[PDB]
Amino acid sequence: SMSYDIQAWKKQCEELLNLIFQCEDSEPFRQPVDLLEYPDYRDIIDTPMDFATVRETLEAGNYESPMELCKDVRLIFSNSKAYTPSKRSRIYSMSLRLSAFFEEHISSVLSDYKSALRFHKRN
Ligand SMILES: Cc1ccccc1NC(N)=S
C-alpha cells in the first residue's frame, strides 16, 4: 500500500488539474478552440489540446503514467507558443506563467512515480 504506491499519481494529477482550472491564467486553455471563430487555428495547429480534454482522459483511465499526462499538458503550451508567438501578447505571458506553475507542481509527481517504479522493478 501507501509508500511507493504506483497509482497515487492519479489523484495527485486530478488535484493539480483542479488548481489549474482555478487559475485565471488557464481561462484560454480550458476548452477546445472553436473552428468557426478561429478558422485558421487548424491551419497552424496539428494536434489541438486543452485542459478539459486532459481532465477527461485522466478520468477515463487513458493515461498509463503521469509522463503521458505531462506530454499532453506540454502540448497545450507548445500549441499556444505556435499560435500566439509574440512575447508582447498578454496571452503569451499567461501561457508562460501557467506553464511554470504546472512544471513546478508536476515535478514531484513525476519524480515520486519514477521512484516507485524503480523500487518495484528492483524488488
Ligand atoms: C489562447 C488562445 C485564445 C484564442 C484562440 C487561440 C488560442 N490559443 C490556443 N488555445 S493554443
Numbering used by the authors: 1313 to 1435
Manuscript text:
The second bromodomain of the pleckstrin homology domain-interacting protein (PHIP(2)) is one of the atypical bromodomains.
All 406 poised fragments in DSPL1 were soaked into PHIP(2) Brd crystals and when the structures were solved, compounds 1–4 were found to have bound to the protein (1.2% hit rate). The thiourea sulfur of compound 1 displaces water I at the back of the binding pocket allowing the formation of hydrogen bonds with Y1353 and water II. The primary thiourea nitrogen lies in the hydrophilic pocket made by waters II, III and IV. The phenyl ring of compound 1 makes an edge–face aromatic interaction with Y1350, which is shifted significantly towards the ligand compared to the NMP-bound conformation. The original fragment hit 1 had pIC50 of 3.11 in the AlphaScreen assay. The LE of fragment hit 1 was calculated to be 0.40.
